[PDB]
A paper describes a structure:
The [name]-[name]-2 translates its genome into polyproteins that must be cleaved to release individual proteins essential for replication of the virus. Given that [name] processes the majority of these sites, any intervention that stops this process, such as an inhibitor, would block viral growth. The crystal structures of inactive [name]-[name]-2 [name], with the catalytic Cys145 mutated to Ala, with 9 substrate and 6 product complexes were determined to sub-2.5 Å resolution. As in previous apo and inhibitor-bound crystal structures, [name] crystallized as a homodimer.
Residue numbers in the entry:
A (entry chain B): 1 to 304
B (entry chain A): 1 to 305
C (entry chain E), D (entry chain F): -6 to -1
Write the structure that this text describes.
Amino acid sequence: SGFRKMAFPSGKVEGCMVQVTCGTTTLNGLWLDDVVYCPRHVICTSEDMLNPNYEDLLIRKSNHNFLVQAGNVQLRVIGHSMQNCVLKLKVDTANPKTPKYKFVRIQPGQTFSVLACYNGSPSGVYQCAMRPNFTIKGSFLNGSAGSVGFNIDYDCVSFCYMHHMELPTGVHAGTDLEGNFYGPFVDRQTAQAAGTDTTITVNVLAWLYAAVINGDRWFLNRFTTTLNDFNLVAMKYNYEPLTQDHVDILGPLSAQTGIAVLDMCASLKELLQNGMNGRTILGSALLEDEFTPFDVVRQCSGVT
Amino acid sequence: SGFRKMAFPSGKVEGCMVQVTCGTTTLNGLWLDDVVYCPRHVICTSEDMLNPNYEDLLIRKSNHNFLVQAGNVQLRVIGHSMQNCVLKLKVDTANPKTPKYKFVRIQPGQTFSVLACYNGSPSGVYQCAMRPNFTIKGSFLNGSAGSVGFNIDYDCVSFCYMHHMELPTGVHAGTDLEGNFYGPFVDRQTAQAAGTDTTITVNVLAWLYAAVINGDRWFLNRFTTTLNDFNLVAMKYNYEPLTQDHVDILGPLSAQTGIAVLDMCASLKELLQNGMNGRTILGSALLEDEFTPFDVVRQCSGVTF
Amino acid sequence: SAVKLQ
Amino acid sequence: SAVKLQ
């Protein structure tokens, strides 16, 4: 029993973290086989933060202008290239701790773990969701760029996020590992704002199923709803539309608990109307939306 | 900026987790040096668990009755003994990945990272606090006993918790790594209840400081309070007594933010008497008490390991 | 219920 | 206000 915001074990990612310095700028890189991936703004100076031309900044650099440190060992850079918003630094040694891995681009509403690092060393690990507006609500300070987000499946690390920057509202933005930003953001210190964020409906429903699995039913009611009427109501509370694909994805949890998805939808409609009235659900006084249906099954079934 | 429930990096501990099987019972063990530590109820069968006589169950066992698997490598057990509620299994192979470590016993209110494991394989990591009633609000299924809780201090992993069991209320209980239970519980399958829990006041104040560091000041007010007056209000709401030692531990956060500890107490008092008025603090509608003052500093200053 | 040894 | 590259 119990339900916690659980991250993946970080060991396999720890063994890939290095430090990259160009000039006086230092951030983190990811060392897989003989390539180090890092955010391209490591080549910026103080004159290059509003409108950097990264092609022009990079052509002025030689391999030996990049200092890569893995623990207390310097790695010699023997080539460099830019791919979208990331640099790829070829080094003369393959990382012997390279796990089996994949680069994936995730969708809004999917979760992942973050290993927050500074100067190539880890600070801690936490669980994140890609918000509908393509930001993440992380915990990142100056120097954390190049920290990564990831999922582990069996023995395979799926890297899905590289951290770049913080928006003025305090939320975070970054790229996939091919250097394409999530969202309509760019690596410039101009004013940029995300779309209005919304609540991840399919995740809230998964979490309500988790609460039932854990033995709590107080919030259910005798009603059902059409998908149409559910979405008309939920939208009024700034919730994301629920699709038939989402309904299908909730099938396993529905079958495990005996509660039809549209009956859980009717529960959620009443929770939004009423609030919790001094009660909590799985220890929270708000409706939680950063667990996916897979996260719930993983944690209530003990996947390792 | 931002504030998250942040666990320690787990790599040093992942390398220490093994599977221990005795008969039909399987759980996790912690492999350090040439010893594997695990809960003593691994020697129980399902019929032995209402009132096990662990002394007699263990006399009946030989080294070969314990199967220890480290990944897919079998570690031969060459000695066994019981220390309180843990077994110590001497093995033929010292763990080459043993980190710098110590065993520590923590006090209520202190936090730690849990590496939840099944069949000797790490499943996930999350933060926990030892509650004032000596339970932890974990996430643990059958087979998770022998999972450990830890903190890191630079070079040294400090192991403070080994998981044993789940109470009827769904909260969890375990021991230190010398096998001494936290709280008034015993390892048998009987009805047992923890004392009524209370809120860890010093941690709530740390979390309010974290909110200030992150630009949340709406709850700050111009009122003042004495330590004694605050405590009189705290007890009415089931909060632990704030002590002077707690006031002192909050020094660095108080000096960082320029808010006196007693002024943060005045803010908390008003939060307790009037609520949040439909507002949130750091994304939460409840007052959070599972961050210690040091947890706040390690996160907000980017301390690494 | 009773305590569950895990 | 401005984005901060980290």
